[PDB]
């Protein structure tokens, strides 16, 4: 595997072995009054600032230099330039990787197979803009002559998580827009509970699927169409109530939607990088096309920051390198995303797909099996909720857990003259300070002494009250969570993921690991029908099927 054979990596690992035990965050800060200044980036986007403070990490000047040299030796800059120029860097599928084209506001040509993609990107955006105007204005009418009140996105994974997360995060920008609903699970609860609250006369369905063959999405779409036709009783009315977002015109036609009712995207748009494309239609419908364009513009700003900045001062590069340090040198399995923002409640779930489906890989570009760790398990809940759930384990468990804490300076709801946001900010700051500093036995002893505890009760309680500290965090703070800033943040993590994949020599852009489960499910489907025993699998699968058939008709 290319990483472990790399001499710059071996140097880093050797240094970690010899010296890492001596790194103490409390002491790093005491020895260096300039530590924050030297280990943070303050990015002025001209539409707000993003501060990436990486000073509370187990690093020094030497470590950062070694990490930057490693990025250089792994060819990160050339790989990046190849992505942006439309090279077919998705080598297992022989595809370009061009989510950066979707938000290329500059309109500089990007060629695939000698042909500029920007005219077709811009054509679809124009069509999206026109459609959003028609629906949001009340002009677009349903089959009984009423304006649309509800938009229902039907899709799963990449066709669900982005639009859901973004509409949730940008909820204050949705005033006067139609309601949005997301249906994703094949579990019939999902579509049933949604349809229960809706009228066929005023509901517009958006069928979102790159392939247009995904079982959950097509089944859900068929159920929706059946519910719709039971009321409308007119096949021609489908064109007023269903729109398709796909690359696969043939399958869209087969489902019963005309290409005029389809907004297209392309094979070089990965599903988990797709919200910037036609897949973002439900975002644009909910918040308006203007705000959708600002989302794209913010991503574009971050794209240019990634493209043009020297590695040592490049935000997604530094984030990627810190992650490699913890993954490949410290062996940490996980990475927590902890946004102190209730609107961002689905941000961590989004990056579960974005990170884990990209970099949860084990074969390199050479065909070699990796002999090192690749992508981490991503998880998290918004602050302050998480503090009262799982921070006990972060402070006093036995796992090292790199955390990114995120927060806007300005709240969308400055209620009680700012009291709530003041408290929120205080907790944001205090938690990373606590994780860094800890509490020494001598400090805990004095607290117990002052609390009026007896020598007997004191000694029994003391060790439980000690915080070992030295737990590293990033703090990412931004002026306000606007559409533009959100776009910049999402793109920043997209590029972090890219940099890590290149350093591991894996393909961040394929997903062969989902195929086997789909195949085995198609085999089991027919076996569930009827009351005969199944014997064709291992004894567990067979036994679970027996239980299902036995318990099917028990009237509880």
Kind and range of the H or E run holding 323: helix 315-324
Q: Where are the alpha helices (DSSP H) in 325-416?
A: 347-351, 358-359, 391-396
Residue identified by tokens 């969570």 is 481
Instruction: Kindly report the number of other CB atoms within 10 A of residue 362's CB atom.
Output: 13
Q: How many binding residues for ligand G6P (CB under 6 A)?
A: 17
Minimum CB distance to a second copy smaller for 309 or for 373: 373
Among 217, 282, 314, 328, binds ligand G6P (CB under 6 A): 217
Q: Where are the alpha helices (DSSP H) in 328-464?
A: 347-351, 358-359, 391-396, 419-437, 441-450, 455-461
- Among candidate residues 72, 111, 313, 388, the one labeled active-site is 388
Please identify, among the stretches 42-50, 116-124, 173-181, 236-244, the one whose residues bind a second copy according to the rule CB under 8 A: 42-50
By CB under 8 A, is residue 388 in contact with a second copy?
A: yes
By CB under 6 A, is residue 421 in contact with ligand G6P?
A: no
| Nearest Cα to Cα of residue 56 among 75, 78, 28, 32 | 28
Whether the CB-CB separation of 460 and 392 falls below 8 Å is answered with no
Strand 111-112 and strand 377-379: pairing? Answer: unpaired
Q: Which of residues 180-209 bind ligand G6P (CB under 6 A)?
A: 209
Among 48, 86, 142, 158, binds ligand G6P (CB under 6 A): 158
Q: Which of residues 489-528 bind ligand G6P (CB under 6 A)?
A: 511, 514
DSSP 3-state of 476: strand
Residue identified by tokens 């399995």 is 333
Shortest distance, CB of residue 516 to ligand G6P, whole angstroms? 11
CA distance 339 to 406: 4
Minimum CB distance to ligand G6P smaller for 106 or for 213: 213
Residues in the chain: 556
- Among candidate residues 61, 518, 522, 523, the one labeled active-site is 518
284, 338, 512 from 403: Cα distances, Å:
31, 7, 29
Residue identified by tokens 């060629």 is 111
Shortest distance, CB of residue 347 to ligand G6P, whole angstroms? 17
Minimum CB distance to ligand G6P smaller for 52 or for 154: 154
Active site residue 30: no
By CB under 6 A, is residue 214 in contact with ligand G6P?
A: yes
Structure tokens at 112: 């695939």
Among 90, 153, 159, 500, binds ligand G6P (CB under 6 A): 159
CA distance 332 to 349: 20
By CB under 8 A, is residue 477 in contact with a second copy?
A: yes
Minimum CB distance to a second copy smaller for 167 or for 482: 482
- Among candidate residues 201, 293, 357, 494, the one labeled active-site is 357
The interface partner of residue 211, options being a second copy, ligand G6P, none and the CB cut-off 5 to 8 Å by kind, is: ligand G6P
125, 136, 153, 292 from 242: Cα distances, Å:
19, 16, 10, 21
Q: State which residue has the least CB distance to ligand G6P.
A: 158
Active site residue 456: no
Residues with their C more than 2.5 Å from the N of the next written residue in the chain, i.e. before a break, are: none
Active site residue 518: yes
Q: Which of residues 252-291 bind ligand G6P (CB under 6 A)?
A: 271-272
Instruction: Give the residue ranges of the annotated binding site.
Output: 158-159, 209-214, 353, 357, 388, 518
Catalytic residues: 357, 388, 518
Annotated binding site for D-glucose 6-phosphate: 158-159, 209-214, 353, 357, 388, 518
Binding site for ligand G6P (CB under 6 A): 155-159, 209-211, 214, 217, 271-272, 357, 387-388, 511, 514
């Amino acid at each position: 595997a290319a990483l472990t054979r790399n001499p710059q990596f071996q140097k880093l690992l050797e240094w970690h072995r010899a010296n890492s035990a001596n790194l103490k965050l409390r002491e790093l800060f005491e020895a260096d009054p300039e530590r924050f200044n030297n280990f943070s980036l303050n990015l002025n986007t001209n539409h707000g600032h993003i501060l990436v403070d990486y000073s509370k990490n187990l690093v020094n000047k030497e470590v950062m230099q070694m990490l930057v040299e490693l990025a250089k030796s792994r060819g990160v800059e050339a790989a990046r330039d190849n992505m942006f120029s439309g090279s077919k860097i998705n080598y297992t599928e022989d595809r370009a990787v061009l989510h950066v084209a979707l938000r290329n506001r500059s309109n500089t040509p990007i060629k695939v197979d000698g042909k500029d993609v920007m005219p077709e990107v811009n054509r679809v955006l124009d069509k999206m803009k026109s459609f959003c105007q028609r629906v949001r204005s009340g002009d677009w009418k349903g089959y009984t002559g009423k304006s649309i009140t509800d938009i229902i996105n039907i899709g799963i994974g990449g066709s669900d998580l982005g639009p859901l997360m973004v509409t949730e995060a940008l909820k204050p920008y949705s005033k006067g827009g139609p309601r949005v609903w997301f249906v994703s699970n094949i579990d019939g609860t999902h579509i049933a509970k949604t349809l229960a609250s809706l009228s066929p006369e005023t509901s517009l369905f958006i069928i979102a699927s790159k392939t247009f063959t995904t079982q959950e999405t097509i089944t859900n779409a068929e159920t929706a169409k059946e519910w719709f036709l039971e009321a409308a009783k007119d096949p021609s009315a489908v064109a007023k109530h269903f729109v398709a977002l796909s690359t696969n015109t043939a399958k869209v036609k087969e489902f019963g939607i005309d290409p005029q009712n389809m907004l297209e995207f392309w094979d070089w748009v990965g599903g988990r990088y797709s919200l910037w494309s036609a897949i973002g239609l439900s975002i644009a419908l909910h918040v308006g096309f203007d705000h959708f364009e600002q989302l794209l513009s913010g991503a574009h700003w971050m794209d240019q920051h990634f493209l043009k900045t020297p590695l040592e001062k490049n935000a997604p590069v530094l984030l990627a390198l810190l992650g490699i340090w913890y993954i490949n040198c410290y062996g940490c399995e996980t990475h927590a995303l902890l946004p102190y923002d209730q609107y961002m409640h689905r941000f961590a779930a989004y990056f579960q797909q974005g990170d884990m489906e990209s970099n949860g890989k084990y074969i390199t570009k050479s065909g070699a099996r990796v002999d090192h760790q690749t992508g981490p398990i991503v998880w998290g809940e918004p602050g302050t909720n998480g503090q009262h759930a799982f921070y006990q384990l972060i402070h006093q468990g036995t796992k090292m857990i790199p955390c990114d804490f995120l927060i806007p300076v300005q709240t969308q709801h400055p209620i009680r003259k700012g009291l709530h946001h003041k408290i929120l900010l205080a907790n944001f700051l205090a938690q990373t300070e606590a994780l860094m500093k800890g509490k020494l036995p001598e400090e805990a002893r004095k607290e117990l002494q002052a609390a009026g505890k007896s020598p007997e009760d004191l000694e029994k309680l003391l060790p439980h009250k000690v915080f070992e500290g030295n737990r590293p965090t990033n703090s990412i703070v931004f002026t306000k969570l606007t559409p533009f800033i959100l776009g910049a943040l999402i793109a920043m993590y997209e590029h972090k993921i890219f940099v890590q994949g290149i350093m591991w020599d894996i393909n961040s852009f394929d997903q062969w690991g989902v195929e086997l489960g789909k195949q085995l499910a198609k085999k089991i489907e027919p076996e569930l029908e009827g009351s005969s025993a199944v014997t064709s699998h291992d004894s567990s699968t067979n036994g679970l099927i027996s239980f299902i058939k036995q318990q099917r008709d028990t009237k509880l």
